[PDB]
Amino acid sequence: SHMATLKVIGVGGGGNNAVNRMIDHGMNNVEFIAINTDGQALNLSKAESKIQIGEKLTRGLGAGANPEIGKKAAEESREQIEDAIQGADMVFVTSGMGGGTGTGAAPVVAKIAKEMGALTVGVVTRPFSFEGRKKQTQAAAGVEAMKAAVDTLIVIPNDRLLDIVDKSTPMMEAFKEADNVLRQGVQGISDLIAVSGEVNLDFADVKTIMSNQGSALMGIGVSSGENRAVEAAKKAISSPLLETSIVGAQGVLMNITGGESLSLFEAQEAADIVQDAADEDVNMIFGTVINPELQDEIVVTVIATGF
Ligand SMILES: Nc1nc2c(ncn2[C@@H]2O[C@H](COP(=O)(O)OP(=O)(O)O)[C@@H](O)[C@H]2O)c(=O)[nH]1
Ligand SMILES: [K+]
């Protein structure tokens, strides 16, 4: 029997913001690591494990939006980063691209985790257009460096947050919507590992769908009542925040969780929604979990790769 160790690593300001908000939300059976140049921010981190990088470089300040400083800071702290990761079977690295620390250090952190054998997933943001072309260009170079260093990468363009707010939505509420991509992905994988399914998926199946793949989609949908399976499957694959949509996916891990009423017909319906949306012949790794506590609720978890 195998119990996978999952860790979430925030790198730089935005990544450490995400870690703090996820801890506040509550996230058990997952270990958090906070990595930053900025000692003032790191002192406010809620993470159990904190690594200040580049103190000789920046004297405790941030990188001042220069990615070369973040890269050097991370490389010089490799051993400390390895020690915090040790034991991990899966590592999520989260960072905002475009600044100095995340852009430069997050790809180093990802490569360290990958060369320790952890399944390594990046979830990163691109800057708002109003932040200017230079920052977009720097972020683009960071995204490409992340893709070369992870097993799978999820990119959230911050511009998509402007598609989901009204004129009054607090910025922090919008940021929590972006956080949900990583948080619900981690939770869905943590639930998959913890529960034996009736059609069982385990961590080896997560590795099949995510190892050495590139772009990825991770989504969850919950629905009740009539047409719940179709509606949950549509919710799982249809986030407006994602650079990589479901279209073009050639591998999908899909788990359906329901009560004792979970029907074979509705499982096929949900699988068909995902196949049709990908517009490809999808290699599906299909799982089912009967949770008797659930009455009329159905949960559909999707991880899509192979773009
Ligand atoms: N969605 C989101 N984006 C953020 C957040 N914090 C910063 N950003 C974005 O991330 C980019 C880099 O900022 P930051 O992570 O603070 O820079 P760094 O510490 O030097 O890596 C910014 O230009 C913003 O686009 C956050 O909490 N949420
Ligand atoms: K399992």
Author numbering: 9 to 315
Please give sentences taken from the publication describing this entry.
FtsZ is an assembling GTPase that plays a key role during bacterial cell division. First, GTP hydrolysis only occurs within the filament, as the complete catalytic site is formed at the interface between adjacent FtsZ monomers. We report a dozen filament structures of the FtsZ core (residues 12 to 316) from the pathogen S. aureus, hereafter SaFtsZ, in complex with various GTP mimetics and metal ions.
Interestingly, mutants Q48A and R143K supported assembly, forming polymers that are stabilized against disassembly by GTP consumption as compared to the wild-type protein. This correlates with reduced GTPase activity by about 6-fold in both mutants. In the structure of the R143K mutant, K143 occupies an equivalent position to that of R143 in the wild-type protein but its positive charge lies 3 Å further from the GDP α- and γ-phosphates. As the R143Q mutant is incompetent for polymerization and catalysis, our results indicate that a positively charged residue in this position is required for GTP hydrolysis. Second, we found that bottom residue R143, which connects to both D213 and the nucleotide γ-phosphate through bridging water B1, contributes to catalysis and that the position of its positive charge is critical for efficient GTP hydrolysis. Accordingly, R143K and not R143Q mutation allows assembly but presents reduced GTPase activity. The role of R143 is likely equivalent to that of the arginine finger in Ras-like GTPases, while in these enzymes, the finger residue contacts the nucleotide directly. While the wild-type protein forms rapidly depolymerizing, single and double, wavy filaments, Q48A and R143K form stabilized, straight, thin filaments that slowly evolve into filamentous ribbons.
